[PDB]
């Protein structure tokens, strides 16, 4: 009964792929994609963009329960990300790729979703994130403490709905420096900040080719 | 805590009948009918037609949760079929009988439902099936990759609802070569392909007497 | 982790009262009242009438989930009765008392609720009951094979709703010989068969003072 | 798998903070705040007021499922309080503070919520409380036996809704002597008994600065 992808790795499973994990407060467990290569391996993936094949402009229930496929574009679901990040102290790794085959990454030494929320869904799965390092620059620390906002559930610090306006779903403030669940607009676009944006690397008008968000215990 | 009917058999239960199984991600478990005779035994039944006593023209929730009785005509439910087929690599056995006491079978070396779906219900319990052998001919490989479609939830490649039109529930494309959840029309019928059809054996206008779909780990 | 009140007794708990039980397919478990005196003890109570303090003219959800208190008048809930009676072969004991301090009982060697139902709620928690003995006479064997009917969910063999007409909830045919979830009308009443009726003992116009329905493995 | 904060303490965790507990009939478990200092420690917190940062004028579902954060103002949820208080015999400790830095406490040797309810939600999570001692005086024993009432679900002994009228959620009679889930009105207020009231200490027109309700096995 591994609790995450690091337990899977330490048990002797060295190959990238889909494995069963059993978080402390999710004993039924569920399947995840494990990255067993990045910085020694043991990363549990919870988000991937790579080809714009999956619609990410989804409502609250979809972002709670998850959508897409573990072998392609997917969102694991905030209920699962909560179950994972509350059972130990996790770091976040974000891998990015542009349409010119360029790559960069952001590492956060602390990452959590609704860590102290009695009802994390009610409380809007608030983001805990700290301690940046990497090549992509920081585009997430400004989002620390913000609730998750979708097109049909607004908990941001804007007078309008940030998720509706920037066609995504994120821990929006007023509104964002990152938007990895945005529209797959494929590189440079005329529209403002409504693509797969990581502003610190490629600004507010470049939708990235590939994103992967994953967690490992520190 | 057997995970399926093969575990039940290997534990020393050799009789056909109803047993408790406990899939990896369904730890509460549920009761299934075990076929302990076919090709050495250890088959978990998830579909049976035999007398048209049970209505199979049911909606999404019915095909998710299951209906009928384990000792007669039933559908185990896609949530249970998902839980079973994701915990190991399963083969599918389909037993068929006509109203002239003729029998045939289809064996598939690979069978799965929503194998990599984050939310298999959202994703429409897509069919994985490959490697045919048997006497009935192949009527399922064309359905590989298709989502499950009911009269009240359309995910097929038709401009209309295949489930509504052919009075069934299946991994419809545009529309089908098999329709084992179709109406129990009892043998030859004037209506087109809306019966218990296995086209490769008995064509598109013969509703079979008996069908049984069951799985065993390879 | 006792599965029922017999496990509780055999573990060395000899006192009547409330205990935790953990049925095979209900691993979370729940509290029940255990009768540790009747015919050696080990009986799991699922119904009690004694003072008409609790309303038994309730809808489908109430009879699924249960109502009242374990220490007084209650219905354990059909989901729990299903979980109990499907994990082994149970007998039913029915204790009755009139308002003249007279007592009688009915014993059934076989009792079950939705024993082979894929979805027992969908299938209406059909009654399995056989092999009568006792002093009260038989008022249940005619109900064998019937689905459970409430005022807001009709699955009986009447043109009207038996539960609505006889102000109860039961495995109604057309309509009943027993009605222990009927109105607490307190002894003889002018109204026809809408009280706590056990017809074989006290006929169709006498609402009993006390009823208790309980199960033990054979 | 500690069942409560006393198990956490006895396992060798001596620090105040958030821990995972696994009640008998809530095996998935959940996180709670443990008080490891008060009278030897081992107290499971289920309510805290301290700064009026969280809205406590919430409906039935919120008081069932819980709200706020474990590290600040929160309500653990009646489903969790039921799961905790039914697995053993618990005492209640209530810590109070006024806006003049004055403190007092109420100890109850017996505390429970829906202890014998078949469906504690249906039954309205009725209060069991007895055996007062402390400095704050008794403001809860009059509430013993009363169901929990919210603005959108009335089970009190008033002709109006006590929760609506006194802007809280409590085991209201007609109506209250305590109201710790009332509005955070900050000390003396003109409005009648609609603040964080503990009448025996600070009367019906003083909203307390701090409240903490917590349980430990006797
Ligand atoms: C970017 O990486 C991908 C995957 O490794 C390569 O396919 C790209 O190479 C380009 O496309 C291939 C099919 C071939 O025509 C090659 O000559 C091209 O350079 C690679 N580079 C770019 C610029 O996309
Ligand atoms: C088909 O198989 C069934 C079950 O084994 C048999 O009952 C059928 O036999 C037929 O019906 C029986 C009752 C008897 O009258 C016999 O003489 C018949 O041949 C069997 N054959 C057919 C053609 O249905
Ligand atoms: C029926 O049983 C009950 C419980 O044991 C008894 O209370 C009844 O006794 C009657 O009521 C008591 C209070 C006392 O007045 C006695 O003299 C009565 O006979 C008992 N009998 C009847 C007829 O109810
Ligand atoms: C009440 O307790 C708090 C926390 O210990 C103290 O801060 C209060 O002290 C008062 O405020 C501080 C900042 C300082 O100005 C001190 O001189 C004040 O007395 C303490 N007392 C009161 C009356 O609030
Ligand atoms: C997209 C977004 O939030 N952009 C910032 C810079 C702003 O509008 O103030
Ligand atoms: C039933 C069905 O789909 N029949 C195929 C042959 C078709 O209509 O093209
Ligand atoms: C109450 C009930 O069903 N009575 C039977 C005898 C009948 O009406 O036929
Ligand atoms: C608030 C409350 O219930 N007060 C009591 C004294 C009453 O009104 O009778
Ligand atoms: Ca807003
Ligand atoms: Ca269609
Ligand atoms: Ca009817
Ligand atoms: Ca009222």
mmCIF file of C-alpha atoms in Angstrom, chain A residues 21-131:
data_model
loop_
_atom_site.group_PDB
_atom_site.id
_atom_site.type_symbol
_atom_site.label_atom_id
_atom_site.label_comp_id
_atom_site.label_asym_id
_atom_site.label_seq_id
_atom_site.Cartn_x
_atom_site.Cartn_y
_atom_site.Cartn_z
ATOM 1 C CA UNK A 21 -1.332 4.738 -4.501
ATOM 2 C CA UNK A 22 -3.292 4.707 -1.173
ATOM 3 C CA UNK A 23 -3.183 8.092 0.666
ATOM 4 C CA UNK A 24 -3.751 8.111 4.502
ATOM 5 C CA UNK A 25 -7.319 9.629 4.261
ATOM 6 C CA UNK A 26 -8.130 8.070 0.798
ATOM 7 C CA UNK A 27 -7.736 4.351 1.697
ATOM 8 C CA UNK A 28 -9.699 3.111 -1.401
ATOM 9 C CA UNK A 29 -6.717 4.613 -3.321
ATOM 10 C CA UNK A 30 -6.523 5.598 -7.032
ATOM 11 C CA UNK A 31 -4.158 5.360 -10.058
ATOM 12 C CA UNK A 32 -1.563 8.134 -10.781
ATOM 13 C CA UNK A 33 1.255 8.667 -13.336
ATOM 14 C CA UNK A 34 4.684 8.320 -11.585
ATOM 15 C CA UNK A 35 7.779 10.201 -12.927
ATOM 16 C CA UNK A 36 10.710 7.920 -11.824
ATOM 17 C CA UNK A 37 13.470 9.892 -13.715
ATOM 18 C CA UNK A 38 13.317 13.621 -12.629
ATOM 19 C CA UNK A 39 15.980 14.377 -9.907
ATOM 20 C CA UNK A 40 16.142 10.686 -8.768
ATOM 21 C CA UNK A 41 12.390 10.038 -9.418
ATOM 22 C CA UNK A 42 9.360 9.404 -7.125
ATOM 23 C CA UNK A 43 7.148 12.292 -8.437
ATOM 24 C CA UNK A 44 3.292 11.954 -8.435
ATOM 25 C CA UNK A 45 1.905 13.846 -11.519
ATOM 26 C CA UNK A 46 -1.415 15.760 -10.968
ATOM 27 C CA UNK A 47 -1.433 17.960 -14.172
ATOM 28 C CA UNK A 48 -0.181 17.496 -17.794
ATOM 29 C CA UNK A 49 -0.673 19.558 -21.015
ATOM 30 C CA UNK A 50 1.052 18.306 -24.246
ATOM 31 C CA UNK A 51 -1.278 18.527 -27.359
ATOM 32 C CA UNK A 52 -4.565 20.405 -26.475
ATOM 33 C CA UNK A 53 -6.529 17.097 -26.942
ATOM 34 C CA UNK A 54 -8.425 17.543 -23.577
ATOM 35 C CA UNK A 55 -10.753 20.500 -22.678
ATOM 36 C CA UNK A 56 -9.391 22.204 -19.475
ATOM 37 C CA UNK A 57 -12.112 24.961 -19.433
ATOM 38 C CA UNK A 58 -14.180 22.771 -17.025
ATOM 39 C CA UNK A 59 -16.366 23.584 -13.961
ATOM 40 C CA UNK A 60 -15.894 23.035 -10.177
ATOM 41 C CA UNK A 61 -16.981 19.318 -10.095
ATOM 42 C CA UNK A 62 -14.494 18.419 -12.924
ATOM 43 C CA UNK A 63 -11.558 20.147 -11.073
ATOM 44 C CA UNK A 64 -12.650 18.449 -7.776
ATOM 45 C CA UNK A 65 -13.021 14.908 -9.269
ATOM 46 C CA UNK A 66 -10.399 15.128 -12.102
ATOM 47 C CA UNK A 67 -10.561 14.593 -15.918
ATOM 48 C CA UNK A 68 -8.463 13.419 -18.925
ATOM 49 C CA UNK A 69 -6.230 10.280 -18.978
ATOM 50 C CA UNK A 70 -3.130 9.476 -16.815
ATOM 51 C CA UNK A 71 -1.123 8.519 -20.000
ATOM 52 C CA UNK A 72 -1.914 11.925 -21.657
ATOM 53 C CA UNK A 73 -3.387 15.370 -20.781
ATOM 54 C CA UNK A 74 -5.189 15.221 -17.371
ATOM 55 C CA UNK A 75 -6.030 16.923 -14.041
ATOM 56 C CA UNK A 76 -5.845 14.384 -11.136
ATOM 57 C CA UNK A 77 -8.569 16.294 -9.169
ATOM 58 C CA UNK A 78 -8.268 18.600 -6.096
ATOM 59 C CA UNK A 79 -9.822 15.922 -3.763
ATOM 60 C CA UNK A 80 -6.856 13.601 -4.705
ATOM 61 C CA UNK A 81 -4.219 16.448 -4.585
ATOM 62 C CA UNK A 82 -5.578 17.339 -1.062
ATOM 63 C CA UNK A 83 -5.413 13.629 0.055
ATOM 64 C CA UNK A 84 -1.765 13.417 -1.215
ATOM 65 C CA UNK A 85 -0.354 16.787 0.063
ATOM 66 C CA UNK A 86 -1.921 16.549 3.626
ATOM 67 C CA UNK A 87 -0.331 13.105 4.468
ATOM 68 C CA UNK A 88 3.282 14.519 4.427
ATOM 69 C CA UNK A 89 5.350 17.661 3.519
ATOM 70 C CA UNK A 90 5.613 17.700 -0.343
ATOM 71 C CA UNK A 91 7.689 19.770 -2.830
ATOM 72 C CA UNK A 92 6.240 20.792 -6.271
ATOM 73 C CA UNK A 93 8.127 20.329 -9.605
ATOM 74 C CA UNK A 94 6.716 22.154 -12.715
ATOM 75 C CA UNK A 95 8.233 21.105 -16.118
ATOM 76 C CA UNK A 96 7.514 23.499 -19.070
ATOM 77 C CA UNK A 97 8.272 23.308 -22.856
ATOM 78 C CA UNK A 98 7.716 25.975 -25.608
ATOM 79 C CA UNK A 99 7.014 25.264 -29.358
ATOM 80 C CA UNK A 100 10.758 25.864 -30.185
ATOM 81 C CA UNK A 101 11.717 22.660 -28.188
ATOM 82 C CA UNK A 102 12.979 24.914 -25.309
ATOM 83 C CA UNK A 103 12.474 23.527 -21.735
ATOM 84 C CA UNK A 104 12.543 25.063 -18.194
ATOM 85 C CA UNK A 105 11.390 24.034 -14.653
ATOM 86 C CA UNK A 106 10.191 25.591 -11.344
ATOM 87 C CA UNK A 107 10.862 23.784 -7.991
ATOM 88 C CA UNK A 108 8.910 24.730 -4.793
ATOM 89 C CA UNK A 109 10.242 23.251 -1.489
ATOM 90 C CA UNK A 110 6.699 23.448 0.039
ATOM 91 C CA UNK A 111 3.372 22.689 -1.787
ATOM 92 C CA UNK A 112 -0.110 21.898 -0.360
ATOM 93 C CA UNK A 113 -3.861 22.221 -1.184
ATOM 94 C CA UNK A 114 -6.393 22.867 1.672
ATOM 95 C CA UNK A 115 -3.736 21.631 4.183
ATOM 96 C CA UNK A 116 -5.715 22.771 7.325
ATOM 97 C CA UNK A 117 -9.258 23.062 5.768
ATOM 98 C CA UNK A 118 -11.927 21.085 7.771
ATOM 99 C CA UNK A 119 -13.832 20.803 4.420
ATOM 100 C CA UNK A 120 -11.246 21.565 1.665
ATOM 101 C CA UNK A 121 -14.043 21.724 -1.021
ATOM 102 C CA UNK A 122 -16.077 24.302 1.041
ATOM 103 C CA UNK A 123 -12.779 26.178 1.779
ATOM 104 C CA UNK A 124 -11.936 26.183 -1.999
ATOM 105 C CA UNK A 125 -8.710 24.050 -1.823
ATOM 106 C CA UNK A 126 -6.460 27.024 -0.827
ATOM 107 C CA UNK A 127 -2.839 26.935 -2.185
ATOM 108 C CA UNK A 128 0.232 26.597 0.110
ATOM 109 C CA UNK A 129 3.490 27.188 -1.906
ATOM 110 C CA UNK A 130 6.981 28.508 -0.883
ATOM 111 C CA UNK A 131 10.777 28.291 -1.582
#
